[PDB]
Amino acid sequence: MQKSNKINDALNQHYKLNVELGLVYAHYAHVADDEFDMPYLGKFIQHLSEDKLGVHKEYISDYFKRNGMKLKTDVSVAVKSIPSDAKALIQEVYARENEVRDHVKAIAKLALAEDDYESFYFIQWYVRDGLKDLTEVDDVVKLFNSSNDKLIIEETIKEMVEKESEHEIWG
Amino acid sequence: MQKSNKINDALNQHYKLNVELGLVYAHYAHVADDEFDMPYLGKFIQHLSEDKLGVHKEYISDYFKRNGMKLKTDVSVAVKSIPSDAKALIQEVYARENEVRDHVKAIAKLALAEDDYESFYFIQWYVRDGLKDLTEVDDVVKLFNSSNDKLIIEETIKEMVEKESEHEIWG
Amino acid sequence: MQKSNKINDALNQHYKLNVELGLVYAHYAHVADDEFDMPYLGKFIQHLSEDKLGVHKEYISDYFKRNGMKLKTDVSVAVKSIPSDAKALIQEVYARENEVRDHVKAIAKLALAEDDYESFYFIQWYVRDGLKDLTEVDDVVKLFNSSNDKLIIEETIKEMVEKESEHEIWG
Amino acid sequence: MQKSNKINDALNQHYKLNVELGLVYAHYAHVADDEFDMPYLGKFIQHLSEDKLGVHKEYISDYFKRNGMKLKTDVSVAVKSIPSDAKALIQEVYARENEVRDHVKAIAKLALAEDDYESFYFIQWYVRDGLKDLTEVDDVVKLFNSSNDKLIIEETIKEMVEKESEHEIWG
Amino acid sequence: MQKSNKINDALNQHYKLNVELGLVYAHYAHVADDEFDMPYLGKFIQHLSEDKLGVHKEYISDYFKRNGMKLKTDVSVAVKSIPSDAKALIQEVYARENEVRDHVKAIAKLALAEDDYESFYFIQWYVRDGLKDLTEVDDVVKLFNSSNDKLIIEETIKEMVEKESEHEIWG
Amino acid sequence: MQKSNKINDALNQHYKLNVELGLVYAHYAHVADDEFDMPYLGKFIQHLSEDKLGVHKEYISDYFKRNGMKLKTDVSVAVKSIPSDAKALIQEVYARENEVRDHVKAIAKLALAEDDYESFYFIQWYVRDGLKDLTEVDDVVKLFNSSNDKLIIEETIKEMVEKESEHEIWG
Ligand SMILES: [Cl-]
Ligand SMILES: [Cl-]
Ligand SMILES: [Cl-]
Ligand SMILES: [Cl-]
Ligand SMILES: [Cl-]
Ligand SMILES: [Cl-]
Ligand SMILES: [Cl-]
Ligand SMILES: [Cl-]
Ligand SMILES: [Cl-]
Ligand SMILES: [Cl-]
Ligand SMILES: [Cl-]
Ligand SMILES: [Cl-]
Ligand SMILES: [Cl-]
Ligand SMILES: [Cl-]
Ligand SMILES: [Cl-]
Ligand SMILES: [Cl-]
Ligand SMILES: [Cl-]
Ligand SMILES: [Cl-]
Ligand SMILES: [Cl-]
Ligand SMILES: [Cl-]
Ligand SMILES: [Cl-]
Ligand SMILES: [Cl-]
Ligand SMILES: [Cl-]
Ligand SMILES: [Cl-]
Ligand SMILES: [Fe+3]
Ligand SMILES: [Fe+3]
Ligand SMILES: [Fe+3]
Ligand SMILES: [Fe+3]
Ligand SMILES: [Fe+3]
Ligand SMILES: [Fe+3]
Ligand SMILES: [Fe+3]
Ligand SMILES: [Fe+3]
Ligand SMILES: [Fe+3]
Ligand SMILES: [Fe+3]
Ligand SMILES: [Fe+3]
Ligand SMILES: [Fe+3]
Ligand SMILES: [Fe+3]
Ligand SMILES: [Fe+3]
Ligand SMILES: [Fe+3]
Ligand SMILES: [Fe+3]
Ligand SMILES: [Fe+3]
Ligand SMILES: [Fe+3]
Ligand SMILES: [Fe+3]
Ligand SMILES: [Fe+3]
Ligand SMILES: [Fe+3]
Ligand SMILES: [Fe+3]
Ligand SMILES: [Fe+3]
Ligand SMILES: [Fe+3]
Ligand SMILES: [Fe+3]
Ligand SMILES: [Fe+3]
Ligand SMILES: [Fe+3]
Ligand SMILES: [Fe+3]
Ligand SMILES: [Fe+3]
Ligand SMILES: [Fe+3]
Ligand SMILES: [Fe+3]
Ligand SMILES: [Fe+3]
Ligand SMILES: [Fe+3]
Ligand SMILES: [Fe+3]
Ligand SMILES: [Fe+3]
Ligand SMILES: [Fe+3]
Ligand SMILES: [Fe+3]
Ligand SMILES: [Fe+3]
Ligand SMILES: [Fe+3]
Ligand SMILES: [Fe+3]
Ligand SMILES: [Fe+3]
Ligand SMILES: [Fe+3]
Ligand SMILES: [Fe+3]
Ligand SMILES: [Fe+3]
Ligand SMILES: [Fe+3]
Ligand SMILES: [Fe+3]
Ligand SMILES: [Fe+3]
Ligand SMILES: [Fe+3]
Ligand SMILES: [Mg+2]
Ligand SMILES: [Mg+2]
Ligand SMILES: [Mg+2]
Ligand SMILES: [Mg+2]
Ligand SMILES: [Mg+2]
Ligand SMILES: [Mg+2]
């Protein structure tokens, strides 16, 4: 039952991605509120930031504890430009979440190629969450095409953030 | 992350199958009660009808919303003969549920061949449910071989329909 | 007390109409959400779909059980074009509900012509519901002429769908 | 939908392994308490014994009921030597749980090779549980390297056994 | 107060008998449900299986802890034929429980011959339980001579299994 | 009321320090559990990690929103060596917290030199917390000099982490 080095490498990279994404989202949350005057968009993006810096990274470190894989912490990220408006801000968040689905798909494929069924089981959470997170971000992108009034958009985001739930399949 | 057309095709076909099955089961439920004098068999088959026309089809339409796949509605079904008695009615329901397991297996195999891990995750619900639904139908088929008294069979179905649960694995 | 064949025919046709309408509405609900970015319009139309595929058809099958009429299941429906925008989507729903009132009126007239007072009683539910359903759809059509902001319309539909009631006359 | 004989064989073997493991663990639990004066270690190992002789074997027999596979009961186990001390006792439990992960991995691989997606679904429980059980045993092995005082180790095991929970992923 | 070797031998043999009986009953429970279509008979026999593999064996191991007797685990059992129908299945369970009473009687006689009054006290539980268990099995055997309808028998077993009790004498 | 650039610079640097510290502590928490077999030390260090990545950084971003200061995200941290044992791990945490007090003192001094009384008020939280956090870490360092038994130390940390409070002055 020796751990896969390739999976170890791919999951360390995914740990890194979730840390750096979380740090960028925290900046984007500040910017949505501070410069675009959209505090509820900020809260939406802040929750996603805390999601990436929270369970997304912690489940990997916990997995590594269980199977002998080695954790690496190697983090480099700088927010050097900002999208020009709130719509492009959330569209960028959408693009990054779409890349998450792509990275996660590669890990699922690699786990089967390695006959690492514990890792294929483990990554199912991330397969499900890749689509759930994208859907939630997509629900906010839509609003900027449905109204030209920032305060109307903000009121619709407020409900989304303040909604209490889980889809049977997508969580 | 472009959606698979083959999976899109297979899931549209499975949507269609669940609609048409649900419509046939609704007819069979009427017939069990009206012509075979087995109202609890009717209720059992009606619940299955509502299961197929409900979450079985709605989960597919919801999935399509999330990933860009296209929904098609193309439905053609006619109930042109009826099984001759209640035993053969439920045996036909059993045969159709067995085909469901077969169709679902093909989709699972196709998702792996396409490296579509979101679709392989999605279909696990249907893999589990294929066997759960078959088991529930099988539990009713058994009764017709265990007693020659319709009212005794009906009393045993009543309990089954009125039972409040979920197996850890099969749901 | 022999059952009317003409009423049997007209009610089988109305069963068919409610099945096929329900299937079209389920498609329209998907489209409202997925392509027009109006999830609450989708939920409104989904509820109507489940109404047609639910009590509207089940009351007919139950009636047939009581009086010897024969149920037929013969269903053919394909959604081959979509209205171009959300306003035209609900306007189409409105047009189909208006045809429902017309079909139901014919059955009421036929029941009196046949001196089938049980069927005239039975159809009163559908006479009342024809106008109630049209009124509910009409309440949504109005919104697209009252605002050019999709998110404002969506917020008004949300309240309608989330409202807890029954008019003394129209139910 | 004919059942796989190879999977049937592999799951009968896994049934056997869980029975025989459970019987050995019951002996080890007696020994931990009776000869090593570690009643809480005994209770920890007894719970694992009841886990193997309980759901681990019963889920297989239940699965076989659902799909036509044949159950075999063929059990041969004799506890002919005992590890020399409590540390080596739990280390042996650890080694056997590590072999469980290996046997379970083979079944997962075989289910995919057989395109037996119901069996691949079924075995996911055992894939998850292979790592959870190993982790729990590993948590006890650690204690013998962290203290040379048996009563201190016993107090830490007591808390573990008396703890009321489930990881989102590993259960 | 040196422990009796003969009693030690007889109680190790009785431990073995309860393990092997429990394993056979678990197979019989599967068969009652799976092949004879009698799930409540299966549950009845499963409870007996868990009774033998539970307190019946655990009380012996606990006794051995208290008095210096040595536990042996030496288990060999294979289910190589099945009774032909449900009636003969429970009749076989009855025959094995009757042998339990006989084995237990020998231990009681041996304890008095050895002036081992702690062991005579200990075995009183098994003397009482030998007759209680036989009575419970006998109550099920009776049903197959009282009705030729499997579903009627199943309904009577359901009540027995779902009954909440203890006789002042026989427990 | 123009914002101080020097304070803006010093608080951006302190934001960076709290991010990078939080990431290092998350690694140290993994290591305490995984390699040093001290899960409660791990939880202690994980809580500190979440403290630094949480309110410590978020209060700064919130302050910047209120006064026109500019947030910068520029993060570079790599965990390239690990302390050799648990005692040196917490001693390193202690050294880093001591540097926090030093950095915070510089900001307080700078705010007075700039007559930036809003920033002097703001930083009082960090002045208080610098000493509270150090005290909490110091309470754990002490344990490694008070016992040579890892499990005894772990039990004392457990209480600390599971304690429900606030000093009137130090919080
Ligand atoms: Cl840079
Ligand atoms: Cl903007
Ligand atoms: Cl994109
Ligand atoms: Cl690969
Ligand atoms: Cl036809
Ligand atoms: Cl019949
Ligand atoms: Cl079949
Ligand atoms: Cl394929
Ligand atoms: Cl067509
Ligand atoms: Cl539109
Ligand atoms: Cl019209
Ligand atoms: Cl007319
Ligand atoms: Cl041997
Ligand atoms: Cl020892
Ligand atoms: Cl090992
Ligand atoms: Cl294989
Ligand atoms: Cl043999
Ligand atoms: Cl039988
Ligand atoms: Cl006998
Ligand atoms: Cl004797
Ligand atoms: Cl470096
Ligand atoms: Cl250490
Ligand atoms: Cl220092
Ligand atoms: Cl200064
Ligand atoms: Fe604000
Ligand atoms: Fe969330
Ligand atoms: Fe723009
Ligand atoms: Fe997430
Ligand atoms: Fe509002
Ligand atoms: Fe409002
Ligand atoms: Fe509101
Ligand atoms: Fe509100
Ligand atoms: Fe009825
Ligand atoms: Fe159900
Ligand atoms: Fe027949
Ligand atoms: Fe189902
Ligand atoms: Fe009854
Ligand atoms: Fe009864
Ligand atoms: Fe009853
Ligand atoms: Fe009842
Ligand atoms: Fe939605
Ligand atoms: Fe309504
Ligand atoms: Fe238009
Ligand atoms: Fe209606
Ligand atoms: Fe409003
Ligand atoms: Fe509102
Ligand atoms: Fe409101
Ligand atoms: Fe409201
Ligand atoms: Fe004890
Ligand atoms: Fe457990
Ligand atoms: Fe040793
Ligand atoms: Fe387990
Ligand atoms: Fe202590
Ligand atoms: Fe204690
Ligand atoms: Fe305690
Ligand atoms: Fe306690
Ligand atoms: Fe069953
Ligand atoms: Fe009992
Ligand atoms: Fe016989
Ligand atoms: Fe007993
Ligand atoms: Fe009865
Ligand atoms: Fe009854
Ligand atoms: Fe009853
Ligand atoms: Fe009852
Ligand atoms: Fe742990
Ligand atoms: Fe704290
Ligand atoms: Fe040292
Ligand atoms: Fe702090
Ligand atoms: Fe304590
Ligand atoms: Fe203590
Ligand atoms: Fe305590
Ligand atoms: Fe305590
Ligand atoms: Mg392969
Ligand atoms: Mg491949
Ligand atoms: Mg007239
Ligand atoms: Mg293949
Ligand atoms: Mg004498
Ligand atoms: Mg001055």
Side-chain angles (χ1 to χ4, degrees), chain C residues 117-147:
Chain C
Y117 295 98
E118 292 175 347
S119 293
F120 186 73
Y121 179 90
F122 171 76
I123 204 74
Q124 295 314 292
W125 189 93
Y126 292 76
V127 176
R128 178 207 48 76
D129 207 66
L131 194 51
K132 190 231 201 154
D133 281 352
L134 184 87
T135 300
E136 287 175 342
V137 170
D138 189 58
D139 283 342
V140 176
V141 177
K142 265 144 190 262
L143 309 181
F144 289 88
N145 294 314
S146 302
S147 172

Tab-separated table of all heavy atoms in Angstrom, chain C residues 117-147:
chain	number	residue	atom	x	y	z
C	117	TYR	N	-74.615	13.664	-15.163
C	117	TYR	CA	-74.469	14.642	-14.093
C	117	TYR	C	-73.274	14.331	-13.193
C	117	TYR	O	-72.633	15.264	-12.696
C	117	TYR	CB	-75.799	14.755	-13.337
C	117	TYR	CG	-76.845	15.319	-14.293
C	117	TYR	CD1	-77.736	14.484	-14.947
C	117	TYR	CD2	-76.869	16.681	-14.612
C	117	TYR	CE1	-78.654	14.981	-15.855
C	117	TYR	CE2	-77.785	17.186	-15.522
C	117	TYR	CZ	-78.669	16.324	-16.146
C	117	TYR	OH	-79.589	16.811	-17.045
C	118	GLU	N	-72.898	13.054	-13.031
C	118	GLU	CA	-71.628	12.774	-12.351
C	118	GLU	C	-70.449	13.404	-13.093
C	118	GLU	O	-69.538	13.965	-12.466
C	118	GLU	CB	-71.410	11.270	-12.184
C	118	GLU	CG	-72.390	10.599	-11.214
C	118	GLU	CD	-72.249	9.090	-11.157
C	118	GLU	OE1	-71.570	8.496	-12.036
C	118	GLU	OE2	-72.810	8.481	-10.215
C	119	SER	N	-70.439	13.334	-14.429
C	119	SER	CA	-69.330	13.958	-15.156
C	119	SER	C	-69.403	15.479	-15.125
C	119	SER	O	-68.359	16.140	-15.131
C	119	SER	CB	-69.277	13.465	-16.598
C	119	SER	OG	-68.927	12.085	-16.620
C	120	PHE	N	-70.607	16.054	-15.101
C	120	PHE	CA	-70.704	17.505	-14.978
C	120	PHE	C	-70.196	17.953	-13.614
C	120	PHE	O	-69.504	18.971	-13.511
C	120	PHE	CB	-72.150	17.979	-15.199
C	120	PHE	CG	-72.285	19.492	-15.228
C	120	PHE	CD1	-71.833	20.222	-16.329
C	120	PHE	CD2	-72.841	20.182	-14.156
C	120	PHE	CE1	-71.938	21.610	-16.360
C	120	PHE	CE2	-72.946	21.572	-14.173
C	120	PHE	CZ	-72.491	22.287	-15.281
C	121	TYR	N	-70.537	17.205	-12.557
C	121	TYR	CA	-69.976	17.483	-11.237
C	121	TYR	C	-68.456	17.372	-11.269
C	121	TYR	O	-67.736	18.294	-10.868
C	121	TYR	CB	-70.561	16.531	-10.181
C	121	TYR	CG	-69.979	16.798	-8.804
C	121	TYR	CD1	-70.582	17.702	-7.936
C	121	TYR	CD2	-68.796	16.193	-8.398
C	121	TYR	CE1	-70.034	17.973	-6.690
C	121	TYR	CE2	-68.226	16.471	-7.154
C	121	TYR	CZ	-68.845	17.358	-6.317
C	121	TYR	OH	-68.290	17.610	-5.096
C	122	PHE	N	-67.951	16.240	-11.753
C	122	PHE	CA	-66.514	16.022	-11.800
C	122	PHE	C	-65.791	17.180	-12.477
C	122	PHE	O	-64.760	17.648	-11.995
C	122	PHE	CB	-66.222	14.712	-12.532
C	122	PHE	CG	-64.770	14.496	-12.830
C	122	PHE	CD1	-63.893	14.112	-11.822
C	122	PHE	CD2	-64.279	14.667	-14.115
C	122	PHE	CE1	-62.547	13.903	-12.092
C	122	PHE	CE2	-62.937	14.465	-14.398
C	122	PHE	CZ	-62.071	14.080	-13.386
C	123	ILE	N	-66.306	17.647	-13.619
C	123	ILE	CA	-65.563	18.629	-14.402
C	123	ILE	C	-65.594	20.024	-13.787
C	123	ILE	O	-64.829	20.896	-14.221
C	123	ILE	CB	-66.080	18.678	-15.857
C	123	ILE	CG1	-64.998	19.210	-16.806
C	123	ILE	CG2	-67.305	19.551	-15.970
C	123	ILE	CD1	-63.868	18.220	-17.118
C	124	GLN	N	-66.452	20.270	-12.788
C	124	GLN	CA	-66.494	21.597	-12.172
C	124	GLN	C	-65.138	21.967	-11.596
C	124	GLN	O	-64.727	23.134	-11.652
C	124	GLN	CB	-67.565	21.657	-11.082
C	124	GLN	CG	-68.975	21.490	-11.609
C	124	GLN	CD	-69.222	22.347	-12.852
C	124	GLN	OE1	-69.254	23.571	-12.774
C	124	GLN	NE2	-69.378	21.698	-14.005
C	125	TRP	N	-64.423	20.978	-11.052
C	125	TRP	CA	-63.067	21.215	-10.577
C	125	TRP	C	-62.202	21.809	-11.680
C	125	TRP	O	-61.451	22.769	-11.459
C	125	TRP	CB	-62.467	19.907	-10.061
C	125	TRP	CG	-61.171	20.094	-9.378
C	125	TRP	CD1	-60.968	20.273	-8.032
C	125	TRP	CD2	-59.871	20.132	-9.992
C	125	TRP	NE1	-59.621	20.426	-7.779
C	125	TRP	CE2	-58.927	20.340	-8.958
C	125	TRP	CE3	-59.413	20.011	-11.311
C	125	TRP	CZ2	-57.547	20.436	-9.206
C	125	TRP	CZ3	-58.027	20.103	-11.558
C	125	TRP	CH2	-57.121	20.309	-10.511
C	126	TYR	N	-62.290	21.233	-12.878
C	126	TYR	CA	-61.492	21.698	-14.004
C	126	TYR	C	-61.994	23.026	-14.548
C	126	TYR	O	-61.198	23.813	-15.063
C	126	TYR	CB	-61.481	20.633	-15.105
C	126	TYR	CG	-60.730	19.385	-14.688
C	126	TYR	CD1	-61.301	18.466	-13.809
C	126	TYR	CD2	-59.451	19.138	-15.151
C	126	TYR	CE1	-60.614	17.318	-13.416
C	126	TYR	CE2	-58.753	17.999	-14.758
C	126	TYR	CZ	-59.341	17.096	-13.889
C	126	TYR	OH	-58.656	15.958	-13.492
C	127	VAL	N	-63.298	23.292	-14.455
C	127	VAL	CA	-63.805	24.611	-14.829
C	127	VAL	C	-63.213	25.675	-13.917
C	127	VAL	O	-62.707	26.704	-14.375
C	127	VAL	CB	-65.341	24.640	-14.780
C	127	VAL	CG1	-65.835	26.049	-15.086
C	127	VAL	CG2	-65.933	23.607	-15.745
C	128	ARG	N	-63.278	25.443	-12.603
C	128	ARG	CA	-62.674	26.382	-11.664
C	128	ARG	C	-61.174	26.498	-11.904
C	128	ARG	O	-60.620	27.605	-11.961
C	128	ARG	CB	-62.957	25.946	-10.223
C	128	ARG	CG	-62.316	26.870	-9.170
C	128	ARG	CD	-62.024	26.128	-7.854
C	128	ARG	NE	-61.337	24.849	-8.076
C	128	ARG	CZ	-60.044	24.719	-8.381
C	128	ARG	NH1	-59.262	25.787	-8.508
C	128	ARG	NH2	-59.529	23.511	-8.567
C	129	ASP	N	-60.499	25.363	-12.069
C	129	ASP	CA	-59.045	25.412	-12.163
C	129	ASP	C	-58.573	26.028	-13.475
C	129	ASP	O	-57.491	26.622	-13.521
C	129	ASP	CB	-58.463	24.018	-11.997
C	129	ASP	CG	-57.060	24.055	-11.440
C	129	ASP	OD1	-56.890	24.474	-10.280
C	129	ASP	OD2	-56.129	23.691	-12.177
C	130	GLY	N	-59.349	25.887	-14.548
C	130	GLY	CA	-58.974	26.538	-15.793
C	130	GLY	C	-58.759	28.026	-15.618
C	130	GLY	O	-57.789	28.591	-16.131
C	131	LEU	N	-59.643	28.676	-14.862
C	131	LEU	CA	-59.520	30.111	-14.650
C	131	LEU	C	-58.471	30.439	-13.596
C	131	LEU	O	-57.738	31.427	-13.735
C	131	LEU	CB	-60.881	30.698	-14.260
C	131	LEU	CG	-60.965	32.225	-14.329
C	131	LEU	CD1	-60.466	32.729	-15.671
C	131	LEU	CD2	-62.379	32.706	-14.065
C	132	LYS	N	-58.382	29.639	-12.532
C	132	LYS	CA	-57.349	29.906	-11.537
C	132	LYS	C	-55.952	29.827	-12.162
C	132	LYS	O	-55.139	30.742	-12.012
C	132	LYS	CB	-57.457	28.938	-10.366
C	132	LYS	CG	-56.550	29.377	-9.217
C	132	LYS	CD	-55.658	28.292	-8.705
C	132	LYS	CE	-55.202	28.662	-7.295
C	132	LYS	NZ	-54.861	27.488	-6.445
C	133	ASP	N	-55.666	28.734	-12.874
C	133	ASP	CA	-54.349	28.584	-13.493
C	133	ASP	C	-54.062	29.713	-14.476
C	133	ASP	O	-52.941	30.237	-14.519
C	133	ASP	CB	-54.251	27.232	-14.197
C	133	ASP	CG	-53.977	26.092	-13.234
C	133	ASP	OD1	-53.722	26.371	-12.051
C	133	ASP	OD2	-54.051	24.925	-13.660
C	134	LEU	N	-55.047	30.079	-15.300
C	134	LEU	CA	-54.846	31.181	-16.236
C	134	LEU	C	-54.515	32.471	-15.497
C	134	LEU	O	-53.620	33.221	-15.907
C	134	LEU	CB	-56.092	31.382	-17.106
C	134	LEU	CG	-55.888	32.457	-18.178
C	134	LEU	CD1	-55.282	31.860	-19.445
C	134	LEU	CD2	-57.175	33.198	-18.498
C	135	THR	N	-55.248	32.754	-14.419
C	135	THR	CA	-55.000	33.949	-13.617
C	135	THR	C	-53.583	33.960	-13.072
C	135	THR	O	-52.920	35.000	-13.059
C	135	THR	CB	-55.998	34.021	-12.455
C	135	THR	OG1	-57.338	34.065	-12.967
C	135	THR	CG2	-55.738	35.261	-11.597
C	136	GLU	N	-53.104	32.808	-12.611
C	136	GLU	CA	-51.765	32.773	-12.050
C	136	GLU	C	-50.730	33.028	-13.123
C	136	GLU	O	-49.792	33.801	-12.911
C	136	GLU	CB	-51.519	31.444	-11.341
C	136	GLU	CG	-52.287	31.373	-10.025
C	136	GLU	CD	-52.183	30.031	-9.328
C	136	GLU	OE1	-51.812	29.028	-9.981
C	136	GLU	OE2	-52.478	29.986	-8.112
C	137	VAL	N	-50.903	32.413	-14.294
C	137	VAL	CA	-49.998	32.673	-15.408
C	137	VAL	C	-50.098	34.128	-15.855
C	137	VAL	O	-49.085	34.786	-16.125
C	137	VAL	CB	-50.301	31.704	-16.561
C	137	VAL	CG1	-49.522	32.125	-17.811
C	137	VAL	CG2	-49.947	30.278	-16.141
C	138	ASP	N	-51.323	34.650	-15.932
C	138	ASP	CA	-51.524	36.043	-16.325
C	138	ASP	C	-50.790	37.002	-15.391
C	138	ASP	O	-50.245	38.017	-15.837
C	138	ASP	CB	-53.018	36.355	-16.350
C	138	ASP	CG	-53.319	37.713	-16.951
C	138	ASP	OD1	-52.924	37.944	-18.115
C	138	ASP	OD2	-53.960	38.536	-16.261
C	139	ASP	N	-50.765	36.693	-14.090
C	139	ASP	CA	-50.060	37.524	-13.118
C	139	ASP	C	-48.569	37.621	-13.420
C	139	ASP	O	-47.925	38.599	-13.032
C	139	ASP	CB	-50.259	36.967	-11.707
C	139	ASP	CG	-51.631	37.287	-11.126
C	139	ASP	OD1	-52.312	38.200	-11.635
C	139	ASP	OD2	-52.019	36.620	-10.148
C	140	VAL	N	-47.997	36.603	-14.063
C	140	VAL	CA	-46.579	36.624	-14.420
C	140	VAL	C	-46.362	37.332	-15.759
C	140	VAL	O	-45.399	38.094	-15.924
C	140	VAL	CB	-46.024	35.183	-14.421
C	140	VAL	CG1	-44.553	35.150	-14.880
C	140	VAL	CG2	-46.144	34.591	-13.024
C	141	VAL	N	-47.250	37.104	-16.730
C	141	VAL	CA	-47.175	37.817	-18.006
C	141	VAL	C	-47.123	39.320	-17.771
C	141	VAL	O	-46.348	40.044	-18.408
C	141	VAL	CB	-48.374	37.445	-18.900
C	141	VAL	CG1	-48.337	38.250	-20.185
C	141	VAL	CG2	-48.415	35.949	-19.198
C	142	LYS	N	-47.952	39.807	-16.844
C	142	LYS	CA	-48.046	41.235	-16.563
C	142	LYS	C	-46.688	41.831	-16.234
C	142	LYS	O	-46.396	42.973	-16.606
C	142	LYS	CB	-49.013	41.473	-15.398
C	142	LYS	CG	-50.434	41.785	-15.824
C	142	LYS	CD	-51.463	41.174	-14.879
C	142	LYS	CE	-52.874	41.270	-15.444
C	142	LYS	NZ	-53.649	42.422	-14.897
C	143	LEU	N	-45.852	41.077	-15.517
C	143	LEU	CA	-44.612	41.638	-14.993
C	143	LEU	C	-43.695	42.100	-16.112
C	143	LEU	O	-42.987	43.101	-15.960
C	143	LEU	CB	-43.898	40.621	-14.113
C	143	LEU	CG	-44.755	39.974	-13.032
C	143	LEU	CD1	-43.895	39.019	-12.223
C	143	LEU	CD2	-45.382	41.054	-12.156
C	144	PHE	N	-43.690	41.375	-17.243
C	144	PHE	CA	-42.807	41.709	-18.354
C	144	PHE	C	-43.231	42.991	-19.054
C	144	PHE	O	-42.419	43.603	-19.757
C	144	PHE	CB	-42.750	40.545	-19.351
C	144	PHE	CG	-42.005	39.349	-18.825
C	144	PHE	CD1	-42.658	38.378	-18.100
C	144	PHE	CD2	-40.635	39.228	-19.013
C	144	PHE	CE1	-41.967	37.292	-17.592
C	144	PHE	CE2	-39.948	38.149	-18.508
C	144	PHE	CZ	-40.616	37.178	-17.798
C	145	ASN	N	-44.476	43.415	-18.875
C	145	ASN	CA	-44.905	44.717	-19.356
C	145	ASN	C	-44.772	45.804	-18.301
C	145	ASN	O	-44.987	46.974	-18.613
C	145	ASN	CB	-46.361	44.656	-19.839
C	145	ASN	CG	-46.533	43.776	-21.063
C	145	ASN	OD1	-45.758	43.864	-22.019
C	145	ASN	ND2	-47.555	42.916	-21.041
C	146	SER	N	-44.438	45.451	-17.061
C	146	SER	CA	-44.352	46.436	-15.996
C	146	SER	C	-42.924	46.819	-15.657
C	146	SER	O	-42.720	47.804	-14.941
C	146	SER	CB	-45.053	45.916	-14.731
C	146	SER	OG	-46.401	45.615	-15.004
C	147	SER	N	-41.940	46.073	-16.143
C	147	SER	CA	-40.553	46.402	-15.866
C	147	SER	C	-39.712	45.832	-16.990
C	147	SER	O	-40.042	44.784	-17.554
C	147	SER	CB	-40.099	45.832	-14.517
C	147	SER	OG	-38.706	46.002	-14.334
